[PDB]
Amino acid sequence: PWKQPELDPDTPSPIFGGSTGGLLRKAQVEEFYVITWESPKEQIFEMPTGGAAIMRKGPNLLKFARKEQCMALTTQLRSKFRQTPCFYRVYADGKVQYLHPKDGVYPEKVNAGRVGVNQNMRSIGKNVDPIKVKFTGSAPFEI
Amino acid sequence: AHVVKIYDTCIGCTQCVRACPLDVLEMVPWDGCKAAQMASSPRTEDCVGCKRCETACPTDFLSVRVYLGNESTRSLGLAY
Amino acid sequence: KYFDVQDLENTTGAWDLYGVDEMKRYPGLQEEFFQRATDAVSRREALNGFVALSAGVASIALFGKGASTLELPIGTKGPRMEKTENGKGGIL
Amino acid sequence: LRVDPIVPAISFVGWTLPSNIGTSALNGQSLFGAFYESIGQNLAHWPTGFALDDKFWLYMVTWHTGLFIVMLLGQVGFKGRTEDYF
Amino acid sequence: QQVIQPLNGDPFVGMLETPVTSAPIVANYLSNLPAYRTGVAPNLRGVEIGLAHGFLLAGPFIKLGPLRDVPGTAEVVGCMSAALVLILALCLSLYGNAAFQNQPSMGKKTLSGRPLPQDPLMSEEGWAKFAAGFTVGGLSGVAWAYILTQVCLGR
Amino acid sequence: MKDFTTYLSTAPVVGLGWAIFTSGLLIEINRFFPDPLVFSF
Amino acid sequence: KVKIAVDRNPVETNFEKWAKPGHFSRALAKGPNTTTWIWNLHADAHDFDNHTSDLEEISRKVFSAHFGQLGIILIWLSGMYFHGARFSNYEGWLSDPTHIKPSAQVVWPIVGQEILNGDVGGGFQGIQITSGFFQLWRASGITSELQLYSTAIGGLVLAAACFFAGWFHYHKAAPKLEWFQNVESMLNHHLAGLLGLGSLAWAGHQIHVSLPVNKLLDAGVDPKEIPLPHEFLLNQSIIADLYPSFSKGLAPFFTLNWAEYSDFLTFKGGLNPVTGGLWLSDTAHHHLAIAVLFLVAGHQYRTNWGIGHSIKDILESHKGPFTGNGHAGLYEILTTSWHAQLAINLALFGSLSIIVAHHMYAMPPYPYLATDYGTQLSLFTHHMWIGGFCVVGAGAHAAIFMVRDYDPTNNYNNLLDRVIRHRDAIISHLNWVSIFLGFHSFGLYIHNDTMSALGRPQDMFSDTAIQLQPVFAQWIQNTHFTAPQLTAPNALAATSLTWGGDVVAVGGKVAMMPIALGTSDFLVHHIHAFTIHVTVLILLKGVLFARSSRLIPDKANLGFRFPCDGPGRGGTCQVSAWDHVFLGLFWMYNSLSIVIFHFSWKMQSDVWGTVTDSGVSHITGGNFAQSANTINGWLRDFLWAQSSQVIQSYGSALSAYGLMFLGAHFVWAFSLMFLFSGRGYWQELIESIVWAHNKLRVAPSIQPRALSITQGRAVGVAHYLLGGIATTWSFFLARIIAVG
């Protein structure tokens, strides 16, 4: 956002019984993600790993293994309870990385504060043929 | 990972950014369409390849393309 | 409190739920008997060489298959054999 | 956790279930006593006890079902008294 | 008042403490077993594991086999078990020379789980040490099964 | 009445008018005229 | 509180909606732009949940659809009665049940087709039927064809009444949701009224009209000289002559001297030696007991008079220490969702059909049914297939409920939440059990194959060599045989002759002979257990992972019936719950085919045959124990040794079975085209054909697209199941009709 909110521990995690689908040996050997949000009341949400958990009042923090799980929980909280979550990626060493939203507004807005990347000023269909890009290691779209 | 490309025939409807389930695409400002915004893809390393953006693309042909390539732990969707 | 950044060696699942540490299991000098016994094969190349030389046992073992009297080398039986196979011809 | 509720008084059912098994004298003389006399000839490592021995296997299985179901109900009813489970 | 709950107060992990694992009889028994012992030397661990396996890999091989009906040959049919434990020792050494590669050392994560050190069995030389102990133990266990099966008395 | 006659123009007009007509025509031809292997020339 | 909430005149009765074909869904109202609209119109015609979210409207729609189904079944039943009344030889078969074959269908002589009208005997020629309708019409007294004619007319009248009831309850008097949610009242009336009063009325029919079959028809009396059923009902002397207890006249029933009705309420453990079926007096006493049991069972729940129970209270009063809450919102789940009830009902319905299949061949209940091997094998096989299809449907609707009507708010720590919480442990254990059963149940067959091929027959799993005997089933068989001497003193003999020692035979042919068990029975039983575990694995995985998996965390929002989730994560094809049902259907077919094969070969080699003075000779050479241990034994002594009748069936009366045999093979081979190929290939090929039509200006107005991804899978599985089932059908029917 206006400043990357640094992820901090000692946050009240939601009450949940022990699940079975989550945090394997990769969540420790390689990397894992963590989502934090703010809840205005006490409700019961559905975790993307099994049953349902409740929403503890105040801050909330959950940890997952894949970025898709955190993104799924993010869109569920944004379309069913009207919240504003944010998740990070914790590496093996302990390097926290801000992930969503990077610009901090939302990824579907403009904000005029980001430069476009991976764009082709030509239209699809104007790409050259496979024969032209031979032994060049590159591809028509990459060119 | 996979290589995503956005062509100039984009209309800026912001549907691919809404259909992406891994926050790969974004909307940057542009000066070549009526909406004055074009999609981009900064988090290409997080592309998984489900091709939901191509289904969300309304123009013919698709302005966004997902060319599959090498696979990593993130692009293979592995949780272990 | 459910997640910590620095002491991540205890919050993600890095545990040993079945292991105890002790320097005693076997009785005195019994271990010494097995130490000297297992010293020769202690290395990787040593054990691979042991089983590689012990692999020739199958070759030698097949030669001494006489005691086994396996159907293979005992005979094929001259009296009864399928040299009358088919009805169109005596042999073919 | 690590303290699964067991009372030494739970043996009261497995020990008070047998009297109740000796009651019926209408057929043979008793389900349990018949189980004891029929198993009595199959205790010194005898080959007998084949499928033809209707008095050993059947009485064993029936008597065991009665004993296990009453031990189960006894533990539920005894330990259920403190957990507000009448 | 349930006998099932999460481990260490954090439920987002896959391992959910169930009665089977929670059980003290199961907890202490698994810890007593020769593989989970970390302080004991690897050679020693390999010999105990190899003794039990070399002994159990004989019986089902000597009763059911190509020469299970020939009286004296049936006792001699237990040699295969020796060939089996030999193949087992070879593949165990093959796994040790490739699991803990020289490039990959500790592989990260010190592991807390109550004040105690990383097992040296996971080292490069530790797996070879274990492979040795398993080889001597399996060969010795097969030989004991064959010696004991002829002087077992009224077997 | 207009709705019933327009309902009768969807699937019955093609699956029960033509099918019944063609099947009945071929069957009555093979019934009055027995089994035809040539032009009877 | 339980009242009759009706809402009169909610939907008009016109043909305006019949004009527009797509009107139930808001997506098909735009019309057909592409050919996929037609297939969407047919696939969404009954998905009432997709029509609206109104539970009252959905409940009204399913209530009228039930009446439509009842009218269809009644029309089919009336057609069978009318065919048996006019185009059959029931009167000729009634005087000679051991020599004339049943037939209730005559074909018209158009192109050839006279050959099908086979000489079934009795001065009649037609298609030989294997439905058992003649044996059923024998069991409840029916002598002439006038009664069958009257039954057909009465059933047609009832069918018209059911169709009128459906129209009435959906357009003129539709009920309300508060009326549909009275599960206690519905259970009370279904247990007390439907089942209980049905058993009581059928017991009364067996007590009065089933009298010729139990006393005059079996005594050799000509069916014409037998008195009409109303004479036995009115005249008490004519019924007192047959059974003397009828002379008492309702006095022992009300004076509690039931011991006087011991002549027509017998408890005989066995079969009738003159007919082969169960005793009619035993079946009557059976129905009388069942009626009393259900009548006392229908008074459990409380409706409007205080006394009774509350299903919500019974469920909420069951909380244990290993299941957390348990049964918390099960009443809310089972009273607001139709898919949950449909899954439970379909599971129990399919399992009940399988029970019916086993008990019918075990204890034959109709006269001259055990000596009709064609109808015996046919009825067993048919009931088995219907049961398997229903269980796969139960596995489908459970996933449909879990995807649509599963709210994670009313289920916090109940059984459903705990089950969805440890789904990984459940699926992994079922996976291991499946693999273990496969190795230990199929490796024995492959091991016997290799041992027989290598010239070592003494090293195979057989009765002569190293054996495996099913001692538990042998002990249960022995227990059931010696059971009427100690644990059933009032029973005359064992409830069945499957484990007995007395072979019964009617007309020279064996009716019910004792069944022995050996090593091959152990091997085939483990084969059955293995295939059942794989089918339950595929279905249970689909149900437990239909909501959200660890690979695809947003599988709930994707729907129930979807193609895949793109080529990401290496590929996610058939990850939907619907795809698991498609895979399951395949495994159910593979399981039930082995079940019916085991039945047919075991019966033909160990029970059926013909008895003579010098022993009993079976249908086959009694090679079930010496040829079932190897895979080559099945392909050689079952499919190749049998089916020779189906093969040589040309020019005979059963010539349609060879045509059905070859035709079924083509349909199965046609399924592979839809099952292996994709969709892009067909779409590009269709594009080339569209160019050819555009060159001649014959381009269809509705642009011609290829089938959907799920449509191709659906078409392929439908063609596959049709081809395989029809192949086994033609083979079974031709073999047992030409041999038995």
Ligand code: CLA
């Ligand atoms: C002639 C009297 C009549 C008339 C004019 C209508 C008219 C109407 N009905 Mg209605 N209905 C009737 C009788 C009638 N119904 C009866 C007897 C029943 C009880 C079954 C119902 C139950 C009923 C329900 C539940 C619903 C309607 C609905 C409707 C409306 C639109 C549906 C439609 O297009 O029909 C469909 C036209 C057809 C021609 C359907 C024929 C299907 C037949 C019965 C199947 C035959 C089986 C087949 C032969 C098997 C072979 C297949 C093979 C593969 C095995 C419409 C205004 C719907 C509605 O109100 O919209 C919300 C609604 O949901 N009706």
Ligand code: CLA
């Ligand atoms: C489940 C399938 C199956 C089974 C049960 C068997 C069984 C057998 N086969 Mg065999 N076989 C099979 C498939 C199978 N086969 C197939 C598919 C082929 C074709 C490729 C063959 C080809 C074949 C040949 C050529 C021969 C056999 C032979 C044999 C016999 C001795 C073989 C042997 O080495 O002993 C068994 C050795 C073992 C190591 C068994 C281990 C037992 C495990 C450990 C279970 C016991 C522990 C268990 C996990 C309990 C848990 C304890 C708990 C505390 C954890 C034996 C009875 C030989 C024979 O002559 O037959 C008499 C022989 O020559 N088979």
Ligand code: CLA
């Ligand atoms: C026995 C199985 C079977 C059958 C019948 C077919 C049949 C066909 N394939 Mg095919 N195929 C099969 C297996 C089969 N395939 C398998 C296993 C594969 C590998 C996956 C393929 C892969 C394949 C490819 C890639 C292609 C074909 C193509 C074709 C069509 C070729 C055109 C032709 O020959 O004229 C017609 C031949 C027929 C046999 C017509 C069958 C219809 C008859 C007349 C019955 C009509 C039904 C009758 C009127 C009753 C209807 C009522 C009923 C609905 C109740 C044809 C319909 C090619 C194609 O599309 O052609 C343009 C093509 O591209 N096939």
Ligand code: CLA
């Ligand atoms: C003792 C009274 C009684 C009886 C005999 C029945 C009988 C039946 N009910 Mg019903 N039910 C009752 C009371 C009763 N119900 C009450 C009080 C309620 C309110 C809680 C319900 C609510 C209810 C629902 C929601 C449904 C049924 C259904 C059914 C049918 C199940 C079809 C079947 O499985 O095979 C058995 C088939 C037969 C025995 C054929 C007999 C056909 C005749 C015509 C049935 C006549 C019985 C009828 C209830 C008489 C009173 C109506 C009168 C005004 C004419 C069956 C005929 C299902 C259905 O609608 O199917 C159409 C269903 O969906 N019932």
Ligand code: CLA
């Ligand atoms: C559940 C079915 C059922 C039915 C329908 C019957 C029916 C009958 N049984 Mg019975 N029975 C049954 C089961 C059944 N039984 C069972 C399960 C057993 C035990 C196994 C018995 C054992 C048994 C014995 C031992 C005897 C009978 C007998 C009878 C007959 C006379 C009984 C009688 O007079 O009672 C009373 C009848 C009534 C009270 C009449 C009903 C009232 C009428 C219908 C009211 C209509 C009036 C209306 C308002 C106005 C008229 C309309 C007009 C103006 C047009 C009768 C036809 C006797 C017999 O054999 O008959 C020869 C007899 O001896 N039964």
Ligand code: CLA
């Ligand atoms: C009590 C029985 C029952 C009931 C009421 C339902 C009801 C329903 N099912 Mg279902 N199901 C059942 C049993 C049942 N099912 C069984 C036994 C199976 C296992 C096979 C399934 C498997 C199943 C699946 C996989 C699906 C459903 C779905 C549905 C829903 C919509 C279906 C539809 O749109 O109809 C449409 C009507 C048709 C498609 C006509 C059927 C045509 C068949 C396939 C041809 C069969 C050929 C015939 C036997 C022989 C013809 C020969 C030829 C020569 C003419 C609906 C609520 C669908 C859903 O989305 O749920 C929400 C879904 O996809 N069911």
Ligand code: CLA
């Ligand atoms: C003949 C073809 C075939 C075969 C052999 C299999 C085999 C298998 N299927 Mg399968 N399947 C098939 C066709 C086949 N399928 C088709 C056509 C479909 C489409 C409907 C499916 C759909 C399907 C599904 C959806 C699933 C399976 C599953 C399985 C596995 C279950 C394992 C088990 O419990 O039994 C035992 C396994 C075997 C007996 C394999 C044979 C091994 C023999 C004994 C060889 C023994 C080893 C040998 C001696 C060593 C060789 C030495 C060599 C290396 C030198 C199994 C390995 C299930 C699964 O994944 O497992 C949980 C699963 O869910 N199948």
Ligand SMILES: CCCCCCCCCCCCCCCC(=O)OC[C@H](COP(=O)(O)OC[C@@H](O)CO)OC(=O)CCCCCCCCCCCCCCC
């Ligand atoms: C013959 C059938 C198959 C044989 C082997 C079956 C074992 C495979 C599955 C076991 C999974 C264990 C997880 C239990 C999950 C579990 O613990 O649930 C909890 C349950 C106790 O729960 P509560 O008392 O808290 O439940 C009370 C309330 O929930 C009431 O609704 O414990 C049991 O199930 C005891 C039965 C153990 C297993 C008995 C096998 C049941 C099969 C049918 C009966 C067989 C009896 C012997 C006949 C031969």
Ligand SMILES: CC1=C(C/C=C(\C)CCC[C@H](C)CCC[C@H](C)CCCC(C)C)C(=O)c2ccccc2C1=O
């Ligand atoms: C062949 C095929 C197609 C093409 C399917 C088509 C074109 C459907 C054909 C439907 C026909 C037109 C229905 C009518 C059939 C005959 C015309 C009936 C004969 C009647 C005569 C008497 C006139 C797919 O779209 C497909 C999709 C996904 C997986 C596999 C496949 C697949 O295998």
Ligand SMILES: CCCCCCCCCCCCCCCCCC=O
């Ligand atoms: C479908 C509409 C008609 C529904 C009513 C059918 C009435 C049929 C009544 C029985 C008719 C039998 C006629 C038999 C004539 C030949 C008699 C010889 O067996």
Ligand code: SF4
């Ligand atoms: S393929 Fe999937 S993950 Fe990749 S950009 Fe498109 S929607 Fe996002």
Ligand code: SF4
């Ligand atoms: S969906 Fe297509 S047209 Fe719309 S913003 Fe994305 S790339 Fe541009």
